[PDB]
Amino acid sequence: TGVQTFRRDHDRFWVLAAHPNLNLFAAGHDGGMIVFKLERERPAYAVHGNMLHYVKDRFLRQLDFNSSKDVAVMQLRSGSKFPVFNMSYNPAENAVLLCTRASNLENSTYDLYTIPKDADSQNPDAPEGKRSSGLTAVWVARNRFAVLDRMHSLLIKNLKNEITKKIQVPNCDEIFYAGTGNLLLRDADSITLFDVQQKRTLASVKISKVKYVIWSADMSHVALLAKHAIVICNRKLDALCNIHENIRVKSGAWDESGVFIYTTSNHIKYAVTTGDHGII
Amino acid sequence: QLFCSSPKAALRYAAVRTLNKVAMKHPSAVTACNLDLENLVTDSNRSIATLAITTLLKTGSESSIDRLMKQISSFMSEISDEFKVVVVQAISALCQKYPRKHAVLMNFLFTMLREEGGFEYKRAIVDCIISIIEENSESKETGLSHLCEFIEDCEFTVLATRILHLLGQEGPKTNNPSKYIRFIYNRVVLEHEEVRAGAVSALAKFGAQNEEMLPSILVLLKRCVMDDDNEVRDRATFYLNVLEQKQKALNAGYILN
Amino acid sequence: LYTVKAILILDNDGDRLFAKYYDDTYPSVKEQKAFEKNIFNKTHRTDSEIALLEGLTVVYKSSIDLYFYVIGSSYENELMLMAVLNCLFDSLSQMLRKNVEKRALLENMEGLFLAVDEIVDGGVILESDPQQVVHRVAL
Amino acid sequence: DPVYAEAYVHVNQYDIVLDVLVVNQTSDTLQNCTLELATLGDLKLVEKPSPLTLAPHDFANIKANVKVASTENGIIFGNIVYDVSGAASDRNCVVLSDIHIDIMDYIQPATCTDAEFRQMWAEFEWENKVTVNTNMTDLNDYLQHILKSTNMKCLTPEKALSGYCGFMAANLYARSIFGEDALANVSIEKPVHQGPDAAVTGHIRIRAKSQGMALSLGDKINLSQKKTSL
């Protein structure tokens, strides 16, 4: 069906193309031409034993291990694929929680899936499969409270478990209407810590995120992402060292809390250990 | 209004300026936007150019639209019926509705003023500075901050004369000493015995008053900064010599007045 | 109303080949030129739909060869004021069968002169339409 | 790949020289691709070790001298695309544009008579400035550090006093390897208890002929100014 028409000059064309590399997409015309580049600049994750999960900025999976030139990780833990609002490991070497239909709606669906075998929606019967409705699900500080959006605005999600899908309107507190943050930062420029309702801050610390906080696997990483720059902390704000580079693209890695791997050309390097620095 | 609203009576411009007065009443004002928008839009007709400034002014404006206009103006002002003159008039009005007040605007304006420029701002400046003083503006730290900087790299010795004179009086009633010093040094930095000279003269009202740290040091400084170049030498020597000649406390009292 | 500071028909070489200061209170042939200069140099054959200089109305025109100046005060509406200015082009044109030219100007002044006194006389415009004139005159 | 090649640049005295490790930890002097020469900037790249084997399990030093006084290429800040090619035991390779090519280094200090200077200062290509404000140090140590880093000149003192405050504006001049003279007056607050300086809010006025390099220089220096995670 005709979705929409888009107008941007050239009352005269004869070609359109989408790459068979699929890299790029472009449209050709008489008066001239345009190329546009896609990305979900920065895009969601989960960890399960010796394996990385990615959600594409652009590009498909690449969700661990490799074999020849480049390999997008196709597995039963479909990462870079779905229509993501948010992806978070529900730790287990066997579980993930996933929101799909992404976007802004009233609310989306989340279908949470088992690593043993994901599905279109996994079983509501199963609690490593559950799906329900809800717009986004988000971490928040002092680590077990969570945000869920299950209204198109502030629901708090809080559970001891991180196989979690909990719904909590209390903590309704707008003054920031449904948008994006993850230890609370509707561009707070702070990660702000809370419980399940309160109308009085516990506290906010001034530090900042990639709009994600990096936990050393599950949900306790004082290793921090920042969008450009990333900072290394131990759990919570202890600024251990602060990272910056200036290429507005890539990554550097932690094994656990603050194990600093840095990539260095055709050389891949440990930034540092004990009092050491190394090329593995 | 409408009927005129395109140079039937190119007369219409004058009126808005006063003859048919405007400073509005609140819902009434909202209604006005369209008409001014036509002129604002049209940009033409000497009668038009003038009209744009008065209408817009009288009815007033949102911040936002200004923004669009700043660009428009960027091209426009030079000649676009010889926009500059209407504009200087407009500008004189700008300095008045905000003469260093809505300082954020004053600064936005300032940046813009210098920027859109040509040169023709200088004339305007004569007014603008005057406006700021009229208020006896208080976001000076900032206001001054823009002025100082820009003027430095927005040049014209002549401006400096005027401003100097004013500044000359003001000193430590508005503090921020290090900065102010910081500036002052710079002003001098420039050559010209003459350029250099003003920083010392302004200083007399200032010195005398001293500020958040000054008397001891005030005494120390004239010493620390000293110059030859004969008559320039002389200026240092003489001020000193003059200084030399009265108990500096007394010295300050007589001279200052 | 004893309102013409001068009406001048100026060349666009800043020259003036006509001026009558109907009314005047400032002088000097020089100052007149100077005053002229600032504005003329500035308008430079270009004119404006309207122009106000000095809070004073400047209605000026240009032809296809000549620059018309009237100085008056913005203190008396355009439409009329212009009407006289209009009257000036038009009648001269019809009557003569030709409007102003530099050439025209050069061959003879007089007619302008003749007209001018009739139309206006000082700071009071006695008249501003051709016809009356047209009959009235018969030179 | 076994063949791992690691490389970095060493610029050793004029000569920007290319350390290359191509280590061919390959299972053989695997066939190698292709390489191409070029005019460069006031430099030209100028050497290739000839062979194209990727000798087995083997490590090699491949040197590129570059020619450091010629080859104009006006692709500023360098950052010009460079090729290592996929042309033989290789299906791809690296095509790269450089980055890593900056100013602070290039220019050497250079000097002037002050009156003339002032006159000149004003006179020069006005067109660039950047601000100094913020650091980790006093401009004693800080200034020295910056100075050494860019290898550039502050022309003259007046004792007024870079100490008690000073409320000193420092005039700096430098001349480079391909000869641009750059002028500064930076006017700066300066550290000292409850007096002033642990920021600046001093303005660095940069004049260099093209604004584009000039401002860029102001930046470059801005990079230089402080000491933090690149």
PDB file of N, CA and C in Angstrom, chain B residues 112-194:
ATOM      1  N   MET B 112      25.310  39.251  16.747  1.00  0.00           N
ATOM      2  CA  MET B 112      24.682  39.487  15.504  1.00  0.00           C
ATOM      3  C   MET B 112      24.983  40.802  14.947  1.00  0.00           C
ATOM      4  N   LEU B 113      25.077  41.815  15.801  1.00  0.00           N
ATOM      5  CA  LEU B 113      25.251  43.179  15.414  1.00  0.00           C
ATOM      6  C   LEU B 113      26.549  43.371  14.754  1.00  0.00           C
ATOM      7  N   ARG B 114      27.549  42.838  15.456  1.00  0.00           N
ATOM      8  CA  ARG B 114      28.905  42.906  15.070  1.00  0.00           C
ATOM      9  C   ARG B 114      29.072  42.185  13.809  1.00  0.00           C
ATOM     10  N   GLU B 115      28.434  41.001  13.809  1.00  0.00           N
ATOM     11  CA  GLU B 115      28.461  39.997  12.790  1.00  0.00           C
ATOM     12  C   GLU B 115      27.886  40.411  11.478  1.00  0.00           C
ATOM     13  N   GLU B 116      26.637  40.889  11.456  1.00  0.00           N
ATOM     14  CA  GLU B 116      25.941  41.273  10.263  1.00  0.00           C
ATOM     15  C   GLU B 116      26.582  42.494   9.702  1.00  0.00           C
ATOM     16  N   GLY B 117      26.880  43.381  10.654  1.00  0.00           N
ATOM     17  CA  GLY B 117      27.921  44.330  10.582  1.00  0.00           C
ATOM     18  C   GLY B 117      27.949  45.297   9.450  1.00  0.00           C
ATOM     19  N   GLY B 118      28.845  44.986   8.495  1.00  0.00           N
ATOM     20  CA  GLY B 118      29.265  45.875   7.465  1.00  0.00           C
ATOM     21  C   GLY B 118      30.326  46.609   8.158  1.00  0.00           C
ATOM     22  N   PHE B 119      29.910  47.685   8.793  1.00  0.00           N
ATOM     23  CA  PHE B 119      30.740  48.383   9.685  1.00  0.00           C
ATOM     24  C   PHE B 119      29.767  49.126  10.544  1.00  0.00           C
ATOM     25  N   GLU B 120      28.573  49.292   9.994  1.00  0.00           N
ATOM     26  CA  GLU B 120      27.603  50.299  10.244  1.00  0.00           C
ATOM     27  C   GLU B 120      27.012  50.303  11.573  1.00  0.00           C
ATOM     28  N   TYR B 121      27.342  49.256  12.290  1.00  0.00           N
ATOM     29  CA  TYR B 121      27.099  49.047  13.660  1.00  0.00           C
ATOM     30  C   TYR B 121      27.680  50.149  14.458  1.00  0.00           C
ATOM     31  N   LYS B 122      28.834  50.721  14.119  1.00  0.00           N
ATOM     32  CA  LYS B 122      29.509  51.638  15.006  1.00  0.00           C
ATOM     33  C   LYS B 122      28.680  52.808  15.499  1.00  0.00           C
ATOM     34  N   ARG B 123      27.942  53.352  14.575  1.00  0.00           N
ATOM     35  CA  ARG B 123      27.011  54.416  14.660  1.00  0.00           C
ATOM     36  C   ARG B 123      25.948  54.064  15.646  1.00  0.00           C
ATOM     37  N   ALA B 124      25.447  52.840  15.434  1.00  0.00           N
ATOM     38  CA  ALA B 124      24.508  52.184  16.272  1.00  0.00           C
ATOM     39  C   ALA B 124      25.031  52.086  17.644  1.00  0.00           C
ATOM     40  N   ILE B 125      26.300  51.723  17.803  1.00  0.00           N
ATOM     41  CA  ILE B 125      26.981  51.521  19.039  1.00  0.00           C
ATOM     42  C   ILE B 125      26.894  52.733  19.821  1.00  0.00           C
ATOM     43  N   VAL B 126      27.062  53.897  19.165  1.00  0.00           N
ATOM     44  CA  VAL B 126      26.978  55.113  19.891  1.00  0.00           C
ATOM     45  C   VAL B 126      25.696  55.147  20.652  1.00  0.00           C
ATOM     46  N   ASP B 127      24.574  54.895  19.982  1.00  0.00           N
ATOM     47  CA  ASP B 127      23.346  54.635  20.699  1.00  0.00           C
ATOM     48  C   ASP B 127      23.300  53.504  21.687  1.00  0.00           C
ATOM     49  N   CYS B 128      23.767  52.321  21.326  1.00  0.00           N
ATOM     50  CA  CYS B 128      23.622  51.140  22.122  1.00  0.00           C
ATOM     51  C   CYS B 128      24.200  51.204  23.473  1.00  0.00           C
ATOM     52  N   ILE B 129      25.456  51.660  23.525  1.00  0.00           N
ATOM     53  CA  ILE B 129      26.231  51.870  24.704  1.00  0.00           C
ATOM     54  C   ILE B 129      25.498  52.801  25.550  1.00  0.00           C
ATOM     55  N   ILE B 130      24.994  53.881  24.928  1.00  0.00           N
ATOM     56  CA  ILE B 130      24.242  54.866  25.647  1.00  0.00           C
ATOM     57  C   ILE B 130      23.054  54.245  26.346  1.00  0.00           C
ATOM     58  N   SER B 131      22.325  53.356  25.668  1.00  0.00           N
ATOM     59  CA  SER B 131      21.193  52.652  26.202  1.00  0.00           C
ATOM     60  C   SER B 131      21.535  51.862  27.409  1.00  0.00           C
ATOM     61  N   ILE B 132      22.631  51.112  27.337  1.00  0.00           N
ATOM     62  CA  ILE B 132      23.070  50.241  28.394  1.00  0.00           C
ATOM     63  C   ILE B 132      23.284  51.036  29.655  1.00  0.00           C
ATOM     64  N   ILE B 133      23.970  52.177  29.530  1.00  0.00           N
ATOM     65  CA  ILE B 133      24.198  53.118  30.588  1.00  0.00           C
ATOM     66  C   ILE B 133      22.908  53.620  31.136  1.00  0.00           C
ATOM     67  N   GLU B 134      21.921  53.944  30.283  1.00  0.00           N
ATOM     68  CA  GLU B 134      20.657  54.479  30.712  1.00  0.00           C
ATOM     69  C   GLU B 134      20.011  53.584  31.692  1.00  0.00           C
ATOM     70  N   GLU B 135      19.946  52.282  31.406  1.00  0.00           N
ATOM     71  CA  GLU B 135      19.505  51.333  32.369  1.00  0.00           C
ATOM     72  C   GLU B 135      20.356  51.375  33.584  1.00  0.00           C
ATOM     73  N   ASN B 136      21.667  51.408  33.290  1.00  0.00           N
ATOM     74  CA  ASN B 136      22.764  51.292  34.191  1.00  0.00           C
ATOM     75  C   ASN B 136      22.802  49.835  34.436  1.00  0.00           C
ATOM     76  N   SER B 137      22.879  49.060  33.326  1.00  0.00           N
ATOM     77  CA  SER B 137      22.719  47.625  33.194  1.00  0.00           C
ATOM     78  C   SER B 137      23.552  46.838  34.166  1.00  0.00           C
ATOM     79  N   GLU B 138      23.065  45.626  34.494  1.00  0.00           N
ATOM     80  CA  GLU B 138      23.508  44.921  35.665  1.00  0.00           C
ATOM     81  C   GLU B 138      23.981  43.532  35.313  1.00  0.00           C
ATOM     82  N   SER B 139      23.662  43.047  34.085  1.00  0.00           N
ATOM     83  CA  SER B 139      24.219  41.840  33.513  1.00  0.00           C
ATOM     84  C   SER B 139      25.385  42.339  32.756  1.00  0.00           C
ATOM     85  N   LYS B 140      26.122  43.255  33.382  1.00  0.00           N
ATOM     86  CA  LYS B 140      27.275  43.817  32.828  1.00  0.00           C
ATOM     87  C   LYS B 140      28.300  42.811  32.739  1.00  0.00           C
ATOM     88  N   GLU B 141      28.338  41.820  33.609  1.00  0.00           N
ATOM     89  CA  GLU B 141      29.494  40.995  33.693  1.00  0.00           C
ATOM     90  C   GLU B 141      29.688  40.314  32.396  1.00  0.00           C
ATOM     91  N   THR B 142      28.579  39.699  31.952  1.00  0.00           N
ATOM     92  CA  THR B 142      28.225  39.276  30.640  1.00  0.00           C
ATOM     93  C   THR B 142      28.159  40.319  29.580  1.00  0.00           C
ATOM     94  N   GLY B 143      27.491  41.449  29.820  1.00  0.00           N
ATOM     95  CA  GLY B 143      27.294  42.437  28.793  1.00  0.00           C
ATOM     96  C   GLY B 143      28.556  42.980  28.254  1.00  0.00           C
ATOM     97  N   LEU B 144      29.381  43.367  29.228  1.00  0.00           N
ATOM     98  CA  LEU B 144      30.737  43.813  29.269  1.00  0.00           C
ATOM     99  C   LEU B 144      31.546  42.753  28.735  1.00  0.00           C
ATOM    100  N   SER B 145      31.229  41.503  29.079  1.00  0.00           N
ATOM    101  CA  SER B 145      32.049  40.425  28.645  1.00  0.00           C
ATOM    102  C   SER B 145      32.029  40.375  27.134  1.00  0.00           C
ATOM    103  N   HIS B 146      30.835  40.410  26.514  1.00  0.00           N
ATOM    104  CA  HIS B 146      30.666  40.471  25.089  1.00  0.00           C
ATOM    105  C   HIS B 146      31.328  41.668  24.489  1.00  0.00           C
ATOM    106  N   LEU B 147      31.097  42.846  25.099  1.00  0.00           N
ATOM    107  CA  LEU B 147      31.619  44.085  24.606  1.00  0.00           C
ATOM    108  C   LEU B 147      33.082  44.067  24.501  1.00  0.00           C
ATOM    109  N   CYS B 148      33.711  43.669  25.598  1.00  0.00           N
ATOM    110  CA  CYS B 148      35.104  43.639  25.762  1.00  0.00           C
ATOM    111  C   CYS B 148      35.689  42.795  24.728  1.00  0.00           C
ATOM    112  N   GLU B 149      35.156  41.572  24.650  1.00  0.00           N
ATOM    113  CA  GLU B 149      35.746  40.657  23.753  1.00  0.00           C
ATOM    114  C   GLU B 149      35.617  41.035  22.393  1.00  0.00           C
ATOM    115  N   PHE B 150      34.414  41.331  21.957  1.00  0.00           N
ATOM    116  CA  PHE B 150      34.154  41.603  20.620  1.00  0.00           C
ATOM    117  C   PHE B 150      34.793  42.732  20.144  1.00  0.00           C
ATOM    118  N   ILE B 151      34.745  43.814  20.917  1.00  0.00           N
ATOM    119  CA  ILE B 151      35.277  45.089  20.563  1.00  0.00           C
ATOM    120  C   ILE B 151      36.666  44.827  20.231  1.00  0.00           C
ATOM    121  N   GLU B 152      37.323  44.048  21.082  1.00  0.00           N
ATOM    122  CA  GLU B 152      38.543  43.446  20.707  1.00  0.00           C
ATOM    123  C   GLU B 152      38.238  42.482  19.576  1.00  0.00           C
ATOM    124  N   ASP B 153      38.572  42.828  18.343  1.00  0.00           N
ATOM    125  CA  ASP B 153      38.137  42.081  17.194  1.00  0.00           C
ATOM    126  C   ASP B 153      36.754  42.433  16.845  1.00  0.00           C
ATOM    127  N   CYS B 154      36.586  43.733  16.622  1.00  0.00           N
ATOM    128  CA  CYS B 154      35.416  44.458  16.217  1.00  0.00           C
ATOM    129  C   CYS B 154      35.833  45.892  16.252  1.00  0.00           C
ATOM    130  N   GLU B 155      37.108  46.124  16.593  1.00  0.00           N
ATOM    131  CA  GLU B 155      37.938  47.286  16.439  1.00  0.00           C
ATOM    132  C   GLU B 155      37.335  48.658  16.672  1.00  0.00           C
ATOM    133  N   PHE B 156      37.862  49.686  15.949  1.00  0.00           N
ATOM    134  CA  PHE B 156      37.496  51.091  15.961  1.00  0.00           C
ATOM    135  C   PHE B 156      37.869  51.694  17.240  1.00  0.00           C
ATOM    136  N   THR B 157      38.909  52.484  17.141  1.00  0.00           N
ATOM    137  CA  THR B 157      39.478  53.203  18.205  1.00  0.00           C
ATOM    138  C   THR B 157      38.484  54.166  18.818  1.00  0.00           C
ATOM    139  N   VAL B 158      37.662  54.757  17.969  1.00  0.00           N
ATOM    140  CA  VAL B 158      36.760  55.802  18.326  1.00  0.00           C
ATOM    141  C   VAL B 158      35.736  55.452  19.401  1.00  0.00           C
ATOM    142  N   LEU B 159      35.248  54.219  19.313  1.00  0.00           N
ATOM    143  CA  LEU B 159      34.344  53.628  20.247  1.00  0.00           C
ATOM    144  C   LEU B 159      34.881  53.557  21.601  1.00  0.00           C
ATOM    145  N   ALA B 160      36.159  53.186  21.610  1.00  0.00           N
ATOM    146  CA  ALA B 160      36.951  52.995  22.761  1.00  0.00           C
ATOM    147  C   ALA B 160      36.995  54.275  23.498  1.00  0.00           C
ATOM    148  N   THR B 161      37.102  55.401  22.783  1.00  0.00           N
ATOM    149  CA  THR B 161      37.159  56.668  23.468  1.00  0.00           C
ATOM    150  C   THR B 161      35.964  56.917  24.293  1.00  0.00           C
ATOM    151  N   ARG B 162      34.824  56.642  23.675  1.00  0.00           N
ATOM    152  CA  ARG B 162      33.625  56.913  24.370  1.00  0.00           C
ATOM    153  C   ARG B 162      33.427  56.064  25.565  1.00  0.00           C
ATOM    154  N   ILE B 163      33.620  54.767  25.348  1.00  0.00           N
ATOM    155  CA  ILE B 163      33.360  53.769  26.323  1.00  0.00           C
ATOM    156  C   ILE B 163      34.280  53.926  27.461  1.00  0.00           C
ATOM    157  N   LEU B 164      35.518  54.334  27.163  1.00  0.00           N
ATOM    158  CA  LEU B 164      36.584  54.520  28.095  1.00  0.00           C
ATOM    159  C   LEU B 164      36.172  55.482  29.091  1.00  0.00           C
ATOM    160  N   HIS B 165      35.634  56.585  28.569  1.00  0.00           N
ATOM    161  CA  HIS B 165      35.303  57.724  29.332  1.00  0.00           C
ATOM    162  C   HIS B 165      34.310  57.234  30.361  1.00  0.00           C
ATOM    163  N   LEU B 166      33.296  56.459  29.925  1.00  0.00           N
ATOM    164  CA  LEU B 166      32.225  55.989  30.779  1.00  0.00           C
ATOM    165  C   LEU B 166      32.722  55.060  31.814  1.00  0.00           C
ATOM    166  N   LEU B 167      33.554  54.143  31.352  1.00  0.00           N
ATOM    167  CA  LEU B 167      34.061  53.090  32.140  1.00  0.00           C
ATOM    168  C   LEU B 167      34.817  53.647  33.257  1.00  0.00           C
ATOM    169  N   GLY B 168      35.477  54.773  32.938  1.00  0.00           N
ATOM    170  CA  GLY B 168      36.365  55.608  33.634  1.00  0.00           C
ATOM    171  C   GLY B 168      35.724  55.949  34.870  1.00  0.00           C
ATOM    172  N   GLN B 169      34.463  56.321  34.835  1.00  0.00           N
ATOM    173  CA  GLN B 169      33.784  56.588  36.050  1.00  0.00           C
ATOM    174  C   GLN B 169      33.468  55.338  36.819  1.00  0.00           C
ATOM    175  N   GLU B 170      33.016  54.284  36.123  1.00  0.00           N
ATOM    176  CA  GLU B 170      32.317  53.221  36.819  1.00  0.00           C
ATOM    177  C   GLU B 170      33.030  52.347  37.781  1.00  0.00           C
ATOM    178  N   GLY B 171      34.197  51.848  37.387  1.00  0.00           N
ATOM    179  CA  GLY B 171      34.955  50.845  38.118  1.00  0.00           C
ATOM    180  C   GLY B 171      34.378  50.030  39.289  1.00  0.00           C
ATOM    181  N   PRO B 172      34.984  49.974  40.490  1.00  0.00           N
ATOM    182  CA  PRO B 172      34.652  49.056  41.558  1.00  0.00           C
ATOM    183  C   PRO B 172      33.319  49.053  42.151  1.00  0.00           C
ATOM    184  N   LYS B 173      32.374  49.894  41.710  1.00  0.00           N
ATOM    185  CA  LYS B 173      31.026  49.711  42.170  1.00  0.00           C
ATOM    186  C   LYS B 173      30.507  48.422  41.582  1.00  0.00           C
ATOM    187  N   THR B 174      30.945  48.076  40.354  1.00  0.00           N
ATOM    188  CA  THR B 174      30.725  46.762  39.827  1.00  0.00           C
ATOM    189  C   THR B 174      32.066  46.147  39.918  1.00  0.00           C
ATOM    190  N   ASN B 175      32.142  45.045  40.667  1.00  0.00           N
ATOM    191  CA  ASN B 175      33.382  44.423  41.006  1.00  0.00           C
ATOM    192  C   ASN B 175      33.950  43.608  39.880  1.00  0.00           C
ATOM    193  N   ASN B 176      34.106  42.286  40.095  1.00  0.00           N
ATOM    194  CA  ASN B 176      34.740  41.310  39.238  1.00  0.00           C
ATOM    195  C   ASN B 176      36.136  41.689  38.837  1.00  0.00           C
ATOM    196  N   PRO B 177      36.964  41.924  39.862  1.00  0.00           N
ATOM    197  CA  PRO B 177      38.207  42.604  39.662  1.00  0.00           C
ATOM    198  C   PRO B 177      39.121  41.944  38.711  1.00  0.00           C
ATOM    199  N   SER B 178      39.382  40.640  38.861  1.00  0.00           N
ATOM    200  CA  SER B 178      40.392  40.021  38.074  1.00  0.00           C
ATOM    201  C   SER B 178      40.129  40.098  36.657  1.00  0.00           C
ATOM    202  N   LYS B 179      38.865  39.879  36.297  1.00  0.00           N
ATOM    203  CA  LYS B 179      38.417  40.020  34.962  1.00  0.00           C
ATOM    204  C   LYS B 179      38.569  41.346  34.444  1.00  0.00           C
ATOM    205  N   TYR B 180      38.130  42.309  35.217  1.00  0.00           N
ATOM    206  CA  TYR B 180      38.100  43.649  34.783  1.00  0.00           C
ATOM    207  C   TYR B 180      39.495  44.120  34.492  1.00  0.00           C
ATOM    208  N   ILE B 181      40.453  43.733  35.347  1.00  0.00           N
ATOM    209  CA  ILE B 181      41.865  43.981  35.240  1.00  0.00           C
ATOM    210  C   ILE B 181      42.343  43.344  34.034  1.00  0.00           C
ATOM    211  N   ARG B 182      41.847  42.117  33.859  1.00  0.00           N
ATOM    212  CA  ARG B 182      42.267  41.246  32.847  1.00  0.00           C
ATOM    213  C   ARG B 182      42.030  41.940  31.565  1.00  0.00           C
ATOM    214  N   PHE B 183      40.852  42.578  31.474  1.00  0.00           N
ATOM    215  CA  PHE B 183      40.433  43.309  30.342  1.00  0.00           C
ATOM    216  C   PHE B 183      41.325  44.402  30.129  1.00  0.00           C
ATOM    217  N   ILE B 184      41.551  45.135  31.216  1.00  0.00           N
ATOM    218  CA  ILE B 184      42.078  46.435  31.149  1.00  0.00           C
ATOM    219  C   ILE B 184      43.392  46.417  30.616  1.00  0.00           C
ATOM    220  N   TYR B 185      44.120  45.376  30.975  1.00  0.00           N
ATOM    221  CA  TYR B 185      45.422  45.177  30.517  1.00  0.00           C
ATOM    222  C   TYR B 185      45.443  45.078  29.056  1.00  0.00           C
ATOM    223  N   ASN B 186      44.475  44.361  28.535  1.00  0.00           N
ATOM    224  CA  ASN B 186      44.331  44.102  27.144  1.00  0.00           C
ATOM    225  C   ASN B 186      44.114  45.311  26.368  1.00  0.00           C
ATOM    226  N   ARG B 187      43.371  46.242  26.952  1.00  0.00           N
ATOM    227  CA  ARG B 187      42.937  47.399  26.242  1.00  0.00           C
ATOM    228  C   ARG B 187      44.073  48.264  25.944  1.00  0.00           C
ATOM    229  N   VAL B 188      44.919  48.297  26.971  1.00  0.00           N
ATOM    230  CA  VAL B 188      46.153  48.949  26.898  1.00  0.00           C
ATOM    231  C   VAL B 188      46.969  48.278  25.888  1.00  0.00           C
ATOM    232  N   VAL B 189      46.894  46.911  25.762  1.00  0.00           N
ATOM    233  CA  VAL B 189      47.871  46.046  25.099  1.00  0.00           C
ATOM    234  C   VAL B 189      48.151  46.666  23.789  1.00  0.00           C
ATOM    235  N   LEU B 190      47.074  47.086  23.134  1.00  0.00           N
ATOM    236  CA  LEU B 190      47.144  47.748  21.894  1.00  0.00           C
ATOM    237  C   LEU B 190      48.041  48.913  21.917  1.00  0.00           C
ATOM    238  N   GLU B 191      48.646  49.168  20.773  1.00  0.00           N
ATOM    239  CA  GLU B 191      49.547  50.242  20.708  1.00  0.00           C
ATOM    240  C   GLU B 191      48.699  51.420  20.591  1.00  0.00           C
ATOM    241  N   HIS B 192      49.363  52.533  20.759  1.00  0.00           N
ATOM    242  CA  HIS B 192      48.800  53.790  20.803  1.00  0.00           C
ATOM    243  C   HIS B 192      49.124  53.989  22.169  1.00  0.00           C
ATOM    244  N   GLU B 193      49.867  55.039  22.335  1.00  0.00           N
ATOM    245  CA  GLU B 193      50.142  55.740  23.516  1.00  0.00           C
ATOM    246  C   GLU B 193      48.798  56.068  24.011  1.00  0.00           C
ATOM    247  N   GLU B 194      47.981  56.549  23.105  1.00  0.00           N
ATOM    248  CA  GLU B 194      46.675  56.926  23.374  1.00  0.00           C
ATOM    249  C   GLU B 194      45.799  55.820  23.897  1.00  0.00           C
TER     250      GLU B 194
END
